[PDB]
Structure formats: structure tokens, C-alpha cells
């Protein structure tokens, strides 16, 4: 076992979150979200680590040595950290839906694509070998979903037709109507093909015009106007926390990581962006 513990977890957005991109890329949005190699939104584990560490150093002010051991000293480091954060893959994004023939309609649904599921399966298979942690449940469920690759499917529910994000009509197949929820929520999961999924997911993102106003004359100050990209509430990212054998890692994996449920990610937190909930996979499967 290269890694002592393997802690895959979900990242349920509680509010809209905004992890900013670092890039000399000129984009349209003044402040875009972080992007993976497929243009999907992601959270660089640099940002996960920085935020979760800044949070832990305050929630547990006594165990700062365990934290400094698992996540590295700050100002004068003598050693490599023992814990690793993997980059957060997008896993499911919420999209407004309009249905044709339901019994009790839905107004929003969870949207994932097959490429995201393939990245998640990569993570799981990679970590099943660098650890003693065999995630049979996630892996077999995601394999059954990936069997149907190349055909939009509703995982559980029976929709057969929808209009996602007010623009995209989609036909849908039941997976088998015989597969549990990947996460035990009340909303169906739509696994879309990738070409339509890209557009749907780009529609689910939230671009927001913002301004600055002269306090004197209640008019927009010159230059004070920019756009700004958010990820919606209820968005689910996926990541893994990984650590090596230290006896500060057994503590971390048993005291610190059982009292993490809510953290503030990204920025724009003075305006409520960032509150997020961690859902350790070992629990939510």
C-alpha cells in the first residue's frame, strides 16, 4: 500500500462556489471558474488543500501538529506532507428540466456525462492499487453505467424525454430501472452523451454581471463592471484524500476526517460563495 488511507469523497455545493482560474488566457468572462482538460469545471487540489487546511487549522486548534504533519508546515518546512489531495472532478451538475410525460414531474435533475464518469473510474482504479481500499460499490455501479456509453440515460427515474436548461431536448433510456442511486438523493441522475452534455453543463454554470457603485452618487463607478462565473448549488464534485503511514495519519483519518462536514472553498465568500459539504464515500455508499 503506497497510501495508508484512501478517502474518496463528494463535494456537495451548499451555495454557489467560485474557485478562480489562474491563467494568462484571455477569456470572455473576467473571472472564470477553474477548468479541467475537457473544459468542465474542476477544483485544483491546490485549492482544495489550501482551503481545507486553512479551515482545519481553526476548527481543531489543538491538533495543529497532526495537521502540520499531514498537510505540511507553513512557513519553515522541513519535510514533505504525508497527505495528498486529488483534483476535484465534476461529478453531477444540476440543470433545470421540463418533462413531457411524468407522473410527478421534476423541475431540476442531476446531469453527468460519460467522460466525467471515466475520469472517476480512473481515480478509483488508480487508488485501488496504491491502497488496500477496494471500492467495489462505486466501481461496479459506475461500470454498469459506463456499459451504456454513448446513449443518454436516466439512471433510475422514467423520463424518456426532457428539455434540459430550457434549450436542449434529449431522449433518454432507463438504465435498467434496476440500479440504486449513486448517492441516495431524491433527484434522478441523467448520464448524457458528451457532446450534448458539454452544452448542458455550460448552461448550468452561472455567469453574473457585477458592478461597483460610487457611494456618493449611486452610479456605476468608471471601470467598476465585470462578469464572474459561479458553479450552482447542489453541484457534486468528486475527489480523494490520500495519506501515508505516520500515526499522525491514523489520527487524521479517524479524528479530523470524521468531524469535517462543512468547509468554505474558493473565494467570494463575503458574498456567500464557497460553503460546501463533504460526504465521505465510505459513508454515502
Amino acid at each position: 500500500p503506497y497510501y495508508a488511507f484512501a478517502e474518496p469523497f463528494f463535494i456537495h455545493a451548499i451555495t454557489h462556489l467560485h474557485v478562480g482560474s489562474g491563467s494568462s488566457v484571455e477569456e470572455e468572462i473576467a473571472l472564470p471558474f477553474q477548468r479541467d482538460e475537457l473544459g468542465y469545471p474542476t477544483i485544483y487540489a491546490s485549492s482544495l488543500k489550501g482551503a481545507i487546511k486553512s479551515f482545519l487549522l481553526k476548527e481543531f486548534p489543538d491538533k495543529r501538529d497532526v495537521i502540520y504533519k499531514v498537510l505540511g508546515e507553513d512557513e519553515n518546512p522541513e519535510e514533505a506532507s504525508l497527505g495528498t489531495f486529488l483534483d476535484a472532478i465534476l461529478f453531477a451538475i444540476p440543470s433545470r428540466i421540463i418533462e413531457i410525460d411524468s407522473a410527478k414531474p421534476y423541475v431540476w435533475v442531476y446531469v453527468t456525462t460519460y467522460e466525467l464518469l471515466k475520469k472517476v473510474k480512473l481515480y478509483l482504479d488508480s487508488i485501488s492499487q496504491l491502497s488496500n481500499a477496494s471500492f467495489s460499490n462505486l466501481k461496479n455501479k459506475i461500470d454498469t453505467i459506463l456499459a451504456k456509453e454513448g446513449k443518454n440515460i436516466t439512471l433510475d427515474s422514467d423520463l424518456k424525454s426532457a428539455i434540459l436548461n430550457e434549450d436542449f431536448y434529449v431522449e433518454l433510456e432507463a438504465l435498467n430501472n434496476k440500479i440504486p442511486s449513486i448517492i441516495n438523493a431524491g433527484v434522478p441522475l441523467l448520464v448524457l452523451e458528451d457532446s450534448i452534455g458539454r452544452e448542458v453543463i455550460n448552461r448550468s454554470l452561472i455567469r453574473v454581471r457585477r458592478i461597483r457603485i460610487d457611494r456618493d452618487k449611486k452610479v456605476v463607478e468608471t471601470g467598476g463592471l465585470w462578469s464572474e462565473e459561479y458553479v450552482p448549488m447542489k453541484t457534486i464534485f468528486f475527489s480523494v484524500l490520500l495519506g501515508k503511514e505516520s500515526k499522525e495519519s491514523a489520527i487524521f483519518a479517524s479524528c479530523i476526517l470524521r468531524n469535517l462536514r462543512y468547509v468554505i472553498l474558493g473565494g467570494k465568500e463575503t458574498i456567500g460563495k464557497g460553503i460546501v459539504e463533504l460526504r465521505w464515500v465510505k459513508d454515502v455508499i
Binding site: 484571455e26 470572455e28 468572462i29 455550460n202 455567469r207 462578469s227
Partner: protein, 151 residues
């Protein structure tokens, strides 16, 4: 790949800064600059193009007060609210489209001369919209940054 677009903007633009005077529909051009760009890739090229041609005054005034730019000089484009200050922008996009061989002049000049061929001009732009959107991106961000700096 795109390094002469910055050179193309000078003699395409030719005036969207000075002879756009009175600072109303002159400074407003920057709204074009930023918004349209975010509009062109979040919403698509053809929606933004339909919006732009909507604001066009395509009689002959906003059909020649621009095709005069192909030939002569700076065109003070006062006219009215942003319909001549808007047909210069239609001119900008179509100027990139002619100077880069995505659509030729002999069609464009002919497409904007019967009102029978405007329709399939747009119907052809609709098929070139992916390629067009990809290609003009830097050429547009050029004038968007021009606007940030100068306009």
C-alpha cells in the same frame, strides 16, 4: 497562427473610435466589445449575429454608408442611435470574413444587393458559425482590449 489579425484590425476598423463621435454610441461601442464577446461564445455566434442585424438599418444607408468603407476613407457614422454605430460592426465582422476568405466579396457584395440573397448569406453564415466563432475570437478580443485601453 493568429498574428496578423492584430494588423488586420487597424485597416479593418479604420474608424470605430474617432469619427464615432459625441461619446454616446462612441463609448457605447465597448458594450459591444465586452458583452458581444461573452455573448458570442456563451450563447453562440448566430444569436449574436441575428441580434446585430436586427439593429441594422439595412435600407441602402446601412448598406452603403458601410460598403463605402471598402474603398475610400474614415466614415463619420453619426446617423442615429446604434444602427449606423451598429452597421459599422456588421461591417467589422464581414470585413474579417472577406479579408480571411471565409466568405468572398463577389458573394458578399452580391448578397447585400438583392434582398433575395441576404437570406442565404445568413443561411451560409449559419453553417460557418463554428469556424467563424473560433477564428474571429482573437480578432475580436483585439478590439475589445482596444476599447478597454483607448475607446
Amino acid at each position: 497562427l493568429y498574428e496578423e489579425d492584430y494588423k488586420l484590425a487597424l485597416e479593418a476598423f479604420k474608424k470605430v473610435f474617432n469619427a464615432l463621435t459625441h461619446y454616446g454610441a462612441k463609448q457605447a461601442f465597448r458594450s459591444r466589445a465586452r458583452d458581444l464577446v461573452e455573448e458570442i461564445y456563451n450563447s453562440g455566434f448566430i444569436p449574436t449575429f441575428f441580434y446585430i442585424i436586427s439593429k441594422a438599418e439595412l435600407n441602402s444607408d446601412s448598406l452603403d454608408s458601410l460598403i463605402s468603407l471598402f474603398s475610400s476613407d474614415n466614415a463619420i457614422l453619426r446617423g442615429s442611435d446604434e444602427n449606423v454605430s451598429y452597421s459599422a460592426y456588421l461591417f467589422i465582422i464581414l470585413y474579417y470574413l472577406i479579408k480571411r476568405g471565409i466568405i468572398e466579396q463577389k458573394f458578399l457584395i452580391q448578397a447585400l444587393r438583392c434582398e433575395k440573397t441576404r437570406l442565404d448569406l445568413i443561411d451560409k453564415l449559419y453553417n460557418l458559425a463554428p469556424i467563424i466563432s473560433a477564428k474571429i475570437r482573437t480578432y475580436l478580443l483585439a478590439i475589445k482590449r482596444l476599447s478597454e485601453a483607448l475607446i
